[PDB]
Amino acid sequence: MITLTTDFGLKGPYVGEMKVAMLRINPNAKIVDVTHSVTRHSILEGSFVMEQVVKYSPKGTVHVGVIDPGVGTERRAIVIEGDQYLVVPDNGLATLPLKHIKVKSVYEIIPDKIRKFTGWEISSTFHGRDIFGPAGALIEKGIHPEEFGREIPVDSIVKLNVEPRKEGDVWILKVIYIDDFGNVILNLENYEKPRTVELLDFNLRLPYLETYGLVEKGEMLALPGSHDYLEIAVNMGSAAERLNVKVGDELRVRLL
Amino acid sequence: MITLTTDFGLKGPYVGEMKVAMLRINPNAKIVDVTHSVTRHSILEGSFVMEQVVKYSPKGTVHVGVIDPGVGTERRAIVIEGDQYLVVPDNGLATLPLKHIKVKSVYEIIPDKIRKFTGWEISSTFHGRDIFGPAGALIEKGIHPEEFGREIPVDSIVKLNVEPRKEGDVWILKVIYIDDFGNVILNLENYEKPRTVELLDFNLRLPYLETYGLVEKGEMLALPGSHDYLEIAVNMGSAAERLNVKVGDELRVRLL
Amino acid sequence: MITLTTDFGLKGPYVGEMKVAMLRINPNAKIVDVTHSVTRHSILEGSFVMEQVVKYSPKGTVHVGVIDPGVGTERRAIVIEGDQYLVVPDNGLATLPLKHIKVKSVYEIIPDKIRKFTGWEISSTFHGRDIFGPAGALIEKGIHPEEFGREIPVDSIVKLNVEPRKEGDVWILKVIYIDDFGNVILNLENYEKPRTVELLDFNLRLPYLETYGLVEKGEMLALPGSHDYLEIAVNMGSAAERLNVKVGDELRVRLL
Amino acid sequence: MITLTTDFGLKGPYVGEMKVAMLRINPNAKIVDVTHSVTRHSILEGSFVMEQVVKYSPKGTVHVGVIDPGVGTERRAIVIEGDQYLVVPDNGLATLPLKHIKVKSVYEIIPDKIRKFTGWEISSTFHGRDIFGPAGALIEKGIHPEEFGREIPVDSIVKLNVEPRKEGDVWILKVIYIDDFGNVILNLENYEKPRTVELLDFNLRLPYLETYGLVEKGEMLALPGSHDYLEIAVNMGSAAERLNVKVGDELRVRLL
Amino acid sequence: MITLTTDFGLKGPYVGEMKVAMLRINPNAKIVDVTHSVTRHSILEGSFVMEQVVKYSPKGTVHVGVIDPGVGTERRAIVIEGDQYLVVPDNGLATLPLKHIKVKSVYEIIPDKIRKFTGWEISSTFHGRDIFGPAGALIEKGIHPEEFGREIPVDSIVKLNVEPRKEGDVWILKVIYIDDFGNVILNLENYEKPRTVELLDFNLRLPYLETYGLVEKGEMLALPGSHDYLEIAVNMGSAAERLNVKVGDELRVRLL
Amino acid sequence: MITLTTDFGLKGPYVGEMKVAMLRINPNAKIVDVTHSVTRHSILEGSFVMEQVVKYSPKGTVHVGVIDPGVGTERRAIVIEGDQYLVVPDNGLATLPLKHIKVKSVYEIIPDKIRKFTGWEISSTFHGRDIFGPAGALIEKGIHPEEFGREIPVDSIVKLNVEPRKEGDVWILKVIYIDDFGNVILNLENYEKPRTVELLDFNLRLPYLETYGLVEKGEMLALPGSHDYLEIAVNMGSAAERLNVKVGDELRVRLL
Numbered sequence A, B, C, D, E, F: 001m002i003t004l005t006t007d008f009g010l011k012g013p014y015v016g017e018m019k020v021a022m023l024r025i026n027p028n029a030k031i032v033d034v035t036h037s038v039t040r041h042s043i044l045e046g047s048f049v050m051e052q053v054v055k056y057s058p059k060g061t062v063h064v065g066v067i068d069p070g071v072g073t074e075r076r077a078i079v080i081e082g083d084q085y086l087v088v089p090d091n092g093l094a095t096l097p098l099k100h101i102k103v104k105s106v107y108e109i110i111p112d113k114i115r116k117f118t119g120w121e122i123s124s125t126f127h128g129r130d131i132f133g134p135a136g137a138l139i140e141k142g143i144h145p146e147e148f149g150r151e152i153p154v155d156s157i158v159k160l161n162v163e164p165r166k167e168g169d170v171w172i173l174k175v176i177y178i179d180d181f182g183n184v185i186l187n188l189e190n191y192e193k194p195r196t197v198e199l200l201d202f203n204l205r206l207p208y209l210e211t212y213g214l215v216e217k218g219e220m221l222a223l224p225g226s227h228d229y230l231e232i233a234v235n236m237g238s239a240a241e242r243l244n245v246k247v248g249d250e251l252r253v254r255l256l
């Protein structure tokens, strides 16, 4: 199957257009919507979203990702062939997902070849419908990427900077994601299970417990989350609205 | 076919993870989204949504519902087997849907027996991806619930208070649901159709008509609705904003 | 394949019911969601959405559209048979889509004939679930529209006025759509590529470029768009935000 | 759903080619094999097979039948549009099936229009793969027959003579089919339940019972059958074996 | 999915009729043909065939088996609910398959209930199309057997005698199956790997090797087979035509 | 989509086992039967059948072919990757199909790596169910062959002699296939179309016409055929029985 991640929004024809276009090229493709509400142009959030889906997807799955603020410009459209596939703009969007994929090859999609398979013209502002979507549909049915692209160096693709630095014993982490519940996710993984977590920027000591219900309603806590990162949440409340933080912001955190 | 109802939200990887996880267990399950926008942790609301879908669903349909504020706590995860199936947390979510299901037996999902099918660790904060989703996928492909759970008494599961109260011929109804148009659904059903409905708390008299268009724009009415419950609405307006009521509120009502 | 376009909203059971009702009629129908977030009762907006999807859908595709403020009134429920199908309320919703369909026949759905196929009572406020959904599903599995309807004149159906007028060298263009990015779409097509677009009501002179990134972040511009309509946008910003416009407004535009 | 009935045989690539050709036109078509073992060029036998399948197929079903001894000659290739479809060579193959289809229109497939859809050259000896298969597939995904054909008179098509004649009290019945068990099927239907059936050509008086087991193993009998035609059988034996008959022979039968 | 095993034959409409009937009741059922060439009325061979398929089928699979010489008589039509399902005539056909199924319940299908789900009349000679097939299709979509049958004692079903006896050191086995290659299968399993195998009825000593190619072309051998029984084969020849044996025949075999 | 071609035969559990085994690995693989009636162990015949199917198959199609007399021996099991995929035993079966596949690489299936995917023991006499079928199902769902095999040189695989020989202007052609009608296919292709074809060995002169019907019933002709090879046939008769030739025989032929 093919998963879809974009920032197109839900109030319009964009998502539908991409889907029917994909079905034109592969009518029996099983298309799974991850989300289309990724913050406009937010490559980092889009990357986090895909990273999570990729972690639980069956090997052989095709992932189309489209947070393309640079659509129409000279940025490359690539295909990452490996354990699973990634069809995304060469803008760093593949960074997080790549952490969980055994890469075999990378290909730059060639617009002229892709239009050979689609039949319709390639717009300058909607590549998800004219390039990325079709490309995903082609791979799903067995077409090799070589057929519509040229290989490129694996290490020649834009990579985002998502790893945290540490000043002594203090962690300087960043908010890589915020869900609809207001739960805040921080770019810290593989750490040792703390007993407490202090958000030095707020002079708050937090209990580090397994789940929301372990603290009373309205109270804040830290948990190992469900995506292997450090999570900060308010039981039945919004941790984001408390600490009043955003994706991209940095926080000094000390793990006790 | 499997239906999905959650409070997960639309911008995140949550829904996508549960779907690929389900497909990873039953690669050709037909998954139908109901909604993922149920007000956060609102079991009553989630229960109303499931009730409606269950009423029109083909017999044999499997319904996965995840509004689970108590995720990872002592609360049980259950499977209800009958006319159709319900796979939800044991927190009352099944209350309304149960009204339309010929129940044969109920089972408690035993985590370890489930992990034997999935192959991956059960998180403490995302049972929709690690327990409920997989359980639904298994039932869908023919696996009996006994395979991953132990039978329990129907009467043992948690239930919500959903009965309307009547003081003489004044009804004390509860707002069980408000849709995107602001139409207010009150928990009154199977009543003699009135000519007028008066909302005693607002000193309003409303005509009881069959549809929105039967009154001028901006005018308020009461109708049979499409879900067998008494509906209050404003033709092309929002009864919820005009009456300023929220799910859970109680209204003194008299039918003339 | 069947497409869906409604103004039902995503926070509710409405979309779920229509779908399970459809799958009940034709259990193996492939249903593709276009959108259910169309502004309440906005027939024009719905019409634009459908037009775009129809242009890229394969021939044979069935399109169910439901933006029905007059549900339950005397307004007709029709089926437009052509190289693609449209199942919609006779309220002008089919106006734009018709521009890309060569119509063969038009039918008026007879409620009593449809009930013979569904088996359940038809409500007064939810025809999408009891009439339109079923109709689309029946056509999808091969049933001829005549079985549940009678032929009517192609030009007897409601039409919206979507044509832009020009006085002198000034275009009076209407905002037929606004997307989640705030990009504004005007009802002007088949025009000669301008160098600059002037929005007289704002004293704004905008550059006509190929894509968003061709200007600085925050700068406004005009583009050929990706839907064959003049598009007013703000690089990574909201054009509708600034111009403070909304679907339906008419702008005086000068093409230089 | 599309059904297939041919005389291609099972020891070859013929059936495989027609199928992959069809899936090439409509990759998600559900193809159901009826039989490909019809006696070579036996149009009558093919017609009986199709009749039976048509009687139980759901409305909307497309039936491709290919028993084509005159492939490549001037014989027409037609499409019979009704509450069910028939895609067959105009050689009388549709005779029996028509008895259960209310015909709406009949078309003559235009080779050049079909080639526009397939993309490959049309052979002279394998139209099932290059014309009929494609035609069925196109209709299945929603393309109207008119796109690749022109309407022709319903009664302008070849018909077989399948009516049984009666002289006095003696029926002259034809063997329209013989199954793998050797059970013989005569073209007599809508007759009053006899007590005994006499096969004059054999001086055999047979008992008319409900099923095989109602007589001794090895004994011959007559039954109402399961296809609404008089059936001559031998309990766990071959009736055609003994009577030494074959599809096409005419038996003089007396109904007592 | 549903598997199908019958003795209907391939030259006719029987198999097709059952399939379309099943799709009427469950149009998205995945139907897999095991075989339809089981020797007429041969319950033992039919049982062996099913036993093998059941061994490799996914849990939850539904198996419809129809070798029904007693069709129309008073023999019971049952459903065996367990690890997997068996929908077959109560004539011993379930014997072998039951060896690999964790049985939960057994049900006698009630003709009157089944016709409630089908809509068409139940013939006396074709229960595969009017009872067994529909029943299989119902279970595949989630309907419980209780819905169209009444439970009966697990041990009240006809069982075939398939186990071998042993006179001292000599085995008196029977031929339970013969494939198209002429390979002979004998009802002996779980035995200790012999070095030689003597067919005392022919005064032949046979090498007991892993596969056909281990002996020269035309030579006979014994192997553990691929179905866990003792197999007798002629490399690239017919072992059945040599020993000139049939299904059901007994052979005195001594394992050295 | 996956096609299947074998010499398994039609009456047995062999084909059914391979299909459920495949579905057990890839539950939603679309499996298309070509034939299972290839003359026992005839690699040449099996190769011809696959060639034809491959010619009309959509790019990306996976073709599983099992005619494997050397099953369980030293013979390798291979996967050929390219335009489409071939999964067959390394015994020459791929010879003809290879002519129509743009080969990218070839792999040898490593038994132990395959068992890691299936979960069950590999038999010594049924690799179609334990190796070839599973391998095809894996490729179909996106698994790269590298995952269960090691690359090998294209030129290393076994190949059949299939070239036609010419002695001056007499051709020495081979009967590469005979279908169910008795039409004889000779291994001659891309030749200047003749007016007459004389079979020197029978002192027969045959007209070269486009189809069967162009000669009287019972008469013999030569035609282009539908598979690009020279075909000899008898209008409504059997050229194979008239010439009394079998696959593999050689005929001295001259084109005038």
Ligand SMILES: Nc1ncnc2c1ncn2[C@@H]1O[C@H](CO)[C@@H](O)[C@H]1O
Residues within 6 Å of the ligand: A007, A008, A040, A041, A042, A066, A067, A068, A069, A070, A071, A125, A126, A127, A128, C181, C183, C212, C213, C233, C234, C235, C236, C237
């Ligand atoms: N106004 C805009 N400015 C910049 N990018 C835009 C704008 N509107 C749409 N895009 C989109 O940005 C998305 C990635 O953020 C791409 O899918 C691209 O289509």
Ligand SMILES: Nc1ncnc2c1ncn2[C@@H]1O[C@H](CO)[C@@H](O)[C@H]1O
Residues within 6 Å of the ligand: A181, A183, A212, A213, A233, A234, A235, A236, A237, B007, B008, B040, B041, B066, B067, B068, B069, B070, B071, B125, B126, B127, B128
């Ligand atoms: N901050 C939170 N407090 C309580 N429950 C939560 C919180 N975030 C998510 N959940 C619940 O946990 C599950 C997965 O998000 C859902 O039941 C969801 O409603």
Ligand SMILES: Nc1ncnc2c1ncn2[C@@H]1O[C@H](CO)[C@@H](O)[C@H]1O
Residues within 6 Å of the ligand: B181, B183, B212, B213, B233, B234, B235, B236, B237, C041, C066, C067, C068, C069, C070, C071, C072, C125, C126, C127
């Ligand atoms: N309050 C409302 N007023 C008018 N239309 C509504 C309202 N709520 C929903 N509708 C939508 O418009 C149709 C007619 O009212 C309904 O079936 C639904 O599609």
Ligand SMILES: Nc1ncnc2c1ncn2[C@@H]1O[C@H](CO)[C@@H](O)[C@H]1O
Residues within 6 Å of the ligand: D041, D066, D067, D068, D069, D070, D071, D072, D125, D126, D127, F181, F183, F212, F213, F233, F234, F235, F236, F237
């Ligand atoms: N030898 C033959 N003579 C006549 N018909 C044949 C012959 N072989 C195949 N056919 C079948 O009849 C059609 C016309 O000959 C062919 O397309 C095929 O369907």
Ligand SMILES: Nc1ncnc2c1ncn2[C@@H]1O[C@H](CO)[C@@H](O)[C@H]1O
Residues within 6 Å of the ligand: D181, D183, D212, D213, D233, D234, D235, D236, D237, E007, E008, E040, E041, E042, E066, E067, E068, E069, E070, E071, E125, E126, E127, E128
């Ligand atoms: N002539 C016959 N005698 C006995 N049984 C028959 C005969 N013809 C068909 N049957 C079939 O026997 C099959 C089982 O052997 C059943 O499917 C039943 O339909």
Ligand SMILES: Nc1ncnc2c1ncn2[C@@H]1O[C@H](CO)[C@@H](O)[C@H]1O
Residues within 6 Å of the ligand: E181, E183, E212, E213, E233, E234, E235, E236, E237, F007, F008, F040, F041, F066, F067, F068, F069, F070, F071, F125, F126, F127, F128
């Ligand atoms: N008796 C036999 N001798 C040689 N090969 C056989 C024999 N029986 C089956 N096979 C082959 O083994 C595989 C499974 O039957 C196929 O390749 C088949 O042709």
